Amino acid sequence: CQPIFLNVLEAIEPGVVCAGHDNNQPDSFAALLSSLNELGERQLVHVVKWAKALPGFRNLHVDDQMAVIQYSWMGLMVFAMGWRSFTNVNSRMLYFAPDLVFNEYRMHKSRMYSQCVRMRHLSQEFGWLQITPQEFLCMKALLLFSIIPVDGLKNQKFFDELRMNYIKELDRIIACKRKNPTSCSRRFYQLTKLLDSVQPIARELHQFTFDLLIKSHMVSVDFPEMMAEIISVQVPKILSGKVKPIYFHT
Ligand SMILES: C[C@]12CCC(=O)C[C@@H]1CC[C@@H]1[C@@H]2CC[C@]2(C)[C@@H](O)CC[C@@H]12
Ligand SMILES: O=Cc1ccccc1O
């Protein structure tokens, strides 16, 4: 008995985070998005402290730590939101936060229905593939190291090593159960397919939040500090092609 890696992931797993949305007032595009933007600002802080508590993370260069966080904050938050939706309301609604649950009506009011549907579909994959709590944690941590600039990072060497170790950890979680190599191999295939399906979803939201920031003043949408900063400086690099995700399959 020495599941050191798994113990840490479960120990640093962020807690509940509210958005502070007023569910007593009628829904409106402006109010809904502004609340999500706030929820994002609040989440980002938790993610920063979460990633810094991850094994080996500290090895990365000070600038690369911030970089990976600023590039995958979108993918990480969605993957976690999809899980909450499955374990809380069985993927029937998007459980963004306790005080911010989106239904068929809100998905429409948000003016991003198509994107919400895709996130719900992702949430459903958790049930169709019978994803275990331990498998979820590993995959989420792996997402952090799933998007870097095509020109590599400051110390790209250390990054590949850390990623390799997290992938190795995913196999242990799979192997430490199955007996035959047919089940393990098959399982790895399924999980990798699940992780890649996240990238497409993330890119669609990256474009939506970017365009929204440009018209924010026009639609009366409030963008927090870091949120506006990261979206107008980091996000563009991804949409331009300077920063691309790391797919397992082609
Ligand atoms: C990451 C958040 C907030 C955290 C969460 O649970 C997932 C969710 C996915 C949609 C994002 C939202 C933050 C604010 C965004 C980026 C809006 O501007 C448009 C898409 C929204
Ligand atoms: O382009 C390279 C790069 C991008 C983000 C962080 C560190 C880097 O070296």
Coordinates of C-alpha atoms and ligand atoms in Angstrom, one line a residue:
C1 CA 0.0 0.0 0.0
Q2 CA 1.6 3.2 -1.3
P3 CA -0.6 5.1 -3.7
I4 CA 1.4 8.3 -3.0
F5 CA 0.4 9.9 -6.3
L6 CA -3.3 9.3 -5.9
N7 CA -3.3 10.5 -2.3
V8 CA -2.0 13.9 -3.3
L9 CA -4.5 14.4 -6.1
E10 CA -7.4 13.6 -3.8
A11 CA -5.9 15.8 -1.0
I12 CA -5.5 19.0 -3.1
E13 CA -8.8 18.6 -5.0
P14 CA -10.4 22.1 -4.9
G15 CA -13.6 22.6 -3.0
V16 CA -16.9 24.2 -3.8
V17 CA -16.8 27.6 -5.5
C18 CA -19.8 29.9 -5.9
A19 CA -20.3 32.7 -8.4
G20 CA -22.4 34.9 -6.3
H21 CA -25.2 35.1 -8.9
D22 CA -28.6 36.5 -8.0
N23 CA -31.0 33.7 -8.8
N24 CA -33.8 35.8 -7.5
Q25 CA -33.7 38.2 -10.4
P26 CA -35.0 37.3 -13.9
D27 CA -32.4 35.8 -16.3
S28 CA -30.6 38.1 -18.8
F29 CA -27.6 37.6 -21.1
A30 CA -25.6 40.3 -19.4
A31 CA -26.1 39.1 -15.8
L32 CA -25.5 35.4 -16.7
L33 CA -22.2 36.0 -18.5
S34 CA -20.9 38.5 -16.0
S35 CA -21.6 35.8 -13.3
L36 CA -19.7 33.2 -15.3
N37 CA -16.8 35.7 -15.7
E38 CA -16.8 36.2 -12.0
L39 CA -16.9 32.4 -11.4
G40 CA -14.0 32.2 -13.7
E41 CA -11.9 34.7 -11.7
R42 CA -12.7 32.9 -8.5
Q43 CA -11.9 29.5 -10.1
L44 CA -8.6 30.7 -11.6
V45 CA -7.3 31.5 -8.0
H46 CA -8.2 27.9 -6.9
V47 CA -6.6 26.4 -10.0
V48 CA -3.4 28.4 -9.4
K49 CA -3.1 27.0 -5.8
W50 CA -4.2 23.6 -7.0
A51 CA -1.5 23.3 -9.8
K52 CA 1.2 24.6 -7.5
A53 CA 0.4 21.7 -5.1
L54 CA 0.8 19.1 -7.9
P55 CA 3.8 16.7 -7.9
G56 CA 6.7 17.9 -10.0
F57 CA 4.9 21.1 -11.0
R58 CA 7.5 23.2 -9.0
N59 CA 10.1 21.7 -11.3
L60 CA 8.9 23.8 -14.3
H61 CA 10.3 27.2 -14.9
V62 CA 8.5 30.0 -13.0
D63 CA 7.3 31.4 -16.3
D64 CA 6.2 28.1 -17.7
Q65 CA 4.0 27.4 -14.6
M66 CA 2.1 30.5 -15.3
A67 CA 2.0 29.8 -19.0
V68 CA 0.5 26.3 -18.8
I69 CA -2.1 27.6 -16.3
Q70 CA -2.9 30.6 -18.5
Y71 CA -3.4 28.3 -21.5
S72 CA -5.3 25.4 -20.0
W73 CA -7.5 27.1 -17.4
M74 CA -10.4 26.8 -19.9
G75 CA -10.0 23.1 -20.5
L76 CA -9.5 22.2 -16.8
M77 CA -12.5 24.1 -15.6
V78 CA -14.8 22.5 -18.2
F79 CA -13.7 19.0 -17.5
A80 CA -14.4 19.5 -13.8
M81 CA -17.7 21.2 -14.5
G82 CA -18.8 18.2 -16.7
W83 CA -18.0 15.9 -13.8
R84 CA -20.0 17.9 -11.3
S85 CA -22.9 17.8 -13.7
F86 CA -22.7 14.0 -13.9
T87 CA -22.3 13.2 -10.2
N88 CA -24.7 16.0 -9.0
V89 CA -27.5 16.1 -11.5
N90 CA -26.7 13.2 -13.8
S91 CA -25.7 15.4 -16.7
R92 CA -29.2 16.7 -16.9
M93 CA -28.0 20.3 -16.5
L94 CA -24.6 22.1 -16.4
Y95 CA -23.6 22.4 -12.8
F96 CA -21.2 25.4 -13.2
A97 CA -21.7 26.3 -9.5
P98 CA -24.2 25.7 -6.6
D99 CA -25.7 29.1 -7.3
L100 CA -25.2 28.9 -11.1
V101 CA -26.9 25.9 -12.6
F102 CA -27.8 26.2 -16.3
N103 CA -30.9 24.5 -17.7
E104 CA -32.2 24.3 -21.3
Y105 CA -33.5 27.8 -20.9
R106 CA -30.3 29.4 -19.5
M107 CA -28.2 27.6 -22.1
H108 CA -30.3 29.6 -24.6
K109 CA -30.2 32.9 -22.7
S110 CA -26.4 32.6 -22.5
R111 CA -26.3 32.9 -26.3
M112 CA -24.0 29.9 -26.4
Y113 CA -26.4 27.0 -26.7
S114 CA -24.4 24.9 -29.1
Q115 CA -21.4 25.1 -26.8
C116 CA -23.4 24.2 -23.7
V117 CA -24.8 21.1 -25.5
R118 CA -21.2 19.9 -26.3
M119 CA -20.3 20.3 -22.6
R120 CA -23.4 18.3 -21.6
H121 CA -22.4 15.6 -24.0
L122 CA -19.0 15.5 -22.4
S123 CA -20.6 15.2 -19.0
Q124 CA -22.6 12.3 -20.3
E125 CA -19.4 10.5 -21.4
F126 CA -18.5 10.1 -17.7
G127 CA -21.6 7.9 -17.3
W128 CA -21.3 6.0 -20.6
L129 CA -17.7 5.1 -20.0
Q130 CA -18.3 4.4 -16.2
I131 CA -15.4 6.8 -15.3
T132 CA -14.2 6.2 -11.8
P133 CA -13.4 9.1 -9.3
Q134 CA -9.7 8.2 -9.4
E135 CA -9.6 8.2 -13.2
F136 CA -11.2 11.6 -13.3
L137 CA -8.6 13.2 -11.1
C138 CA -5.7 11.8 -13.2
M139 CA -7.2 12.9 -16.5
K140 CA -7.8 16.4 -15.1
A141 CA -4.2 16.8 -13.9
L142 CA -3.1 15.5 -17.3
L143 CA -5.1 18.3 -19.0
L144 CA -2.9 20.9 -17.3
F145 CA 0.0 19.6 -19.4
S146 CA -2.0 19.3 -22.7
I147 CA -1.5 22.7 -24.3
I148 CA 1.8 24.5 -25.1
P149 CA 3.1 26.9 -27.7
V150 CA 4.3 25.2 -30.9
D151 CA 7.7 26.9 -30.3
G152 CA 7.9 25.0 -27.0
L153 CA 8.3 26.4 -23.5
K154 CA 11.2 28.0 -21.6
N155 CA 12.4 24.6 -20.4
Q156 CA 10.4 22.2 -22.7
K157 CA 12.7 19.4 -21.5
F158 CA 11.3 19.3 -17.9
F159 CA 7.7 19.6 -19.2
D160 CA 7.8 16.5 -21.3
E161 CA 9.2 14.5 -18.3
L162 CA 6.4 15.7 -16.0
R163 CA 3.8 14.9 -18.7
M164 CA 5.2 11.5 -19.2
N165 CA 5.0 10.7 -15.5
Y166 CA 1.4 11.8 -15.3
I167 CA 0.5 9.6 -18.3
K168 CA 2.4 6.7 -16.6
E169 CA 0.3 7.3 -13.5
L170 CA -2.9 7.0 -15.6
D171 CA -1.8 3.5 -16.7
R172 CA -1.3 2.4 -13.1
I173 CA -4.8 3.4 -12.2
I174 CA -6.1 1.4 -15.1
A175 CA -3.8 -1.6 -14.6
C176 CA -4.3 -1.7 -10.9
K177 CA -7.7 -3.3 -11.5
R178 CA -7.9 -5.1 -14.9
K179 CA -6.2 -8.5 -15.2
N180 CA -5.9 -9.1 -19.0
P181 CA -3.9 -6.8 -21.3
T182 CA -7.0 -6.6 -23.6
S183 CA -9.0 -4.6 -21.0
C184 CA -6.1 -2.3 -20.0
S185 CA -5.3 -1.5 -23.7
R186 CA -8.9 -1.0 -24.5
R187 CA -9.4 1.2 -21.4
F188 CA -6.4 3.4 -22.2
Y189 CA -7.9 3.9 -25.7
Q190 CA -11.2 5.0 -24.3
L191 CA -9.7 7.5 -21.7
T192 CA -7.4 9.1 -24.3
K193 CA -10.3 9.5 -26.6
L194 CA -12.2 11.2 -23.8
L195 CA -9.4 13.7 -23.1
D196 CA -9.0 14.7 -26.7
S197 CA -12.7 15.4 -27.0
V198 CA -12.1 18.2 -24.5
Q199 CA -9.8 20.3 -26.8
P200 CA -12.5 21.0 -29.5
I201 CA -14.9 22.1 -26.7
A202 CA -12.3 24.4 -25.2
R203 CA -11.4 26.1 -28.5
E204 CA -15.1 27.0 -29.1
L205 CA -15.3 28.7 -25.8
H206 CA -12.0 30.5 -26.3
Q207 CA -13.4 32.2 -29.4
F208 CA -16.7 33.0 -27.6
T209 CA -15.0 34.7 -24.6
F210 CA -12.6 36.5 -26.8
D211 CA -15.3 38.0 -29.1
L212 CA -17.4 38.8 -26.0
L213 CA -14.6 40.9 -24.5
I214 CA -14.4 43.0 -27.6
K215 CA -18.1 43.8 -27.4
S216 CA -18.3 43.6 -23.6
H217 CA -19.1 47.4 -23.4
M218 CA -21.8 47.0 -26.1
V219 CA -23.6 44.1 -24.3
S220 CA -23.0 45.4 -20.8
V221 CA -20.8 42.5 -19.7
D222 CA -18.3 42.8 -16.9
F223 CA -14.9 41.2 -17.2
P224 CA -12.8 40.9 -14.0
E225 CA -9.1 41.8 -13.7
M226 CA -7.1 38.7 -14.7
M227 CA -10.0 37.5 -16.9
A228 CA -9.7 40.5 -19.3
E229 CA -5.9 40.4 -19.1
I230 CA -5.6 36.6 -19.9
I231 CA -8.3 36.7 -22.6
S232 CA -6.8 39.6 -24.5
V233 CA -3.2 38.5 -24.2
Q234 CA -3.0 34.7 -23.7
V235 CA -6.2 33.4 -25.4
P236 CA -5.3 35.1 -28.7
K237 CA -2.1 33.1 -29.0
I238 CA -4.2 29.9 -29.1
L239 CA -6.7 31.2 -31.6
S240 CA -3.9 32.5 -33.8
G241 CA -2.2 29.1 -33.8
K242 CA 0.8 30.0 -31.6
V243 CA -0.4 27.7 -28.9
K244 CA -1.9 24.3 -29.7
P245 CA -3.2 21.4 -27.6
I246 CA -1.5 18.0 -27.4
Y247 CA -3.8 15.3 -28.9
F248 CA -3.2 11.5 -28.3
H249 CA -5.0 10.5 -31.5
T250 CA -5.1 12.2 -34.9
Ligands
LIG1 C1 -14.7 28.6 -17.4 C2 -16.3 28.8 -16.9 C3 -16.3 29.1 -15.4 C4 -15.9 27.9 -14.5 C5 -16.7 26.7 -15.0 O1 -17.2 26.0 -14.2 C6 -16.7 26.3 -16.4 C7 -17.1 27.5 -17.3 C8 -17.1 27.2 -18.8 C9 -17.6 28.5 -19.6 C10 -16.8 29.8 -19.3 C11 -16.8 30.0 -17.8 C12 -16.0 31.4 -17.5 C13 -16.5 32.6 -18.3 C14 -16.6 32.3 -19.8 C15 -15.2 32.2 -20.4 C16 -17.5 33.2 -20.7 O2 -16.9 34.5 -21.1 C17 -17.8 32.4 -22.0 C18 -17.5 30.9 -21.6 C19 -17.4 31.0 -20.1
LIG2 O1 6.9 30.4 -26.8 C1 7.4 29.9 -25.9 C2 6.8 30.0 -24.4 C3 5.5 30.2 -24.3 C4 4.9 30.3 -23.0 C5 5.8 30.2 -21.9 C6 7.1 29.9 -22.1 C7 7.6 29.8 -23.3 O2 9.0 29.6 -23.5

